Amino acid sequence: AATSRPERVWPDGVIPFVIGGNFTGSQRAVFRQAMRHWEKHTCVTFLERTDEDSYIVFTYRPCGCCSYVGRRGGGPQAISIGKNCDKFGIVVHELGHVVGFWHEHTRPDRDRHVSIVRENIQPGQEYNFLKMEPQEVESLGETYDFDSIMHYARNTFSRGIFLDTIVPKYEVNGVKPPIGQRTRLSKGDIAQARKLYKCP
Ligand SMILES: CCCCC[C@H](CN(O)CO)C(=O)NCNC(=O)c1cc2cccc(OC)c2o1
Ligand SMILES: [Zn+2]
Ligand SMILES: [Zn+2]
Fold it and tell me: What, per the annotation, is the impact of changing residue 150 to V?
């Protein structure tokens, strides 16, 4: 679910950043590691902000809302992190938003790959399962990626941990594909981000 909007692609793949107050040393170390993980597998690079107009700010905030997707432009933008959502893999996902990705399950073609089980969604959290409009996404010829760091888990916003809100439709390698990994950028994520940023 890469943005279709070229103004949201950070020019030259260089993203200035600031780390705000109220984090521990350890949380700040994880931020740098997550930024470096992006740097290792793509041409995207994070740079400590000096005088740039547009830049990201790591802000202490309760988990959930919101990390701006892609470059806002004309000023600072938030990448929001809190106590329960600050592990390496979560921050990598959040930087996925920064660089221009929405959630994989909101791809316009998602109904060919997953079922949404509405009845299992926590009340008032249904908006998290809305498809993006076709005009807002350009997937760049890349197939729907179950292993994506941007893909929800089977029971994300579920009323109970044993109930699925998202179910993949078909078996891949003879078994239903696992979703919701927060370990690393997937092969699919790397391929897609390289196209988005026109990496060499
Ligand atoms: C109101 C939308 C709730 C979004 C919450 C999620 C949390 N994560 O999954 C983080 O990984 C989120 O941040 N998704 C990505 N960002 C957005 O969807 C989003 C929309 C939006 C609209 C106006 C202003 C914003 O400022 C940060 C926005 O973020
Ligand atoms: Zn997200
Ligand atoms: Zn994808």
Answer: In OI13; partial loss of activity
Q: Which residue has 């890349």 as its token pair?
A: 142
Q: If DSSP codes are grouped into helix, strand and coil, which group holds residue 10?
A: coil
| Contact indicator for 196, 41 with CB cutoff of 8 Å | no
Q: Which atom of ligand 1 is nearest to the CA of 102?
A: 15
**CATH 3.40.390.10 applies to domain 1-200:** yes
Experimental method: X-ray
CA distance 105 to 91: 18
Q: Is 2 helix (H, G, I), strand (E, B) or coil?
A: strand
Helix axes 187-196, 88-99, angle to 10 degrees: 30
d(CA 152, CA 179): 7
Resolution (A): 2.3
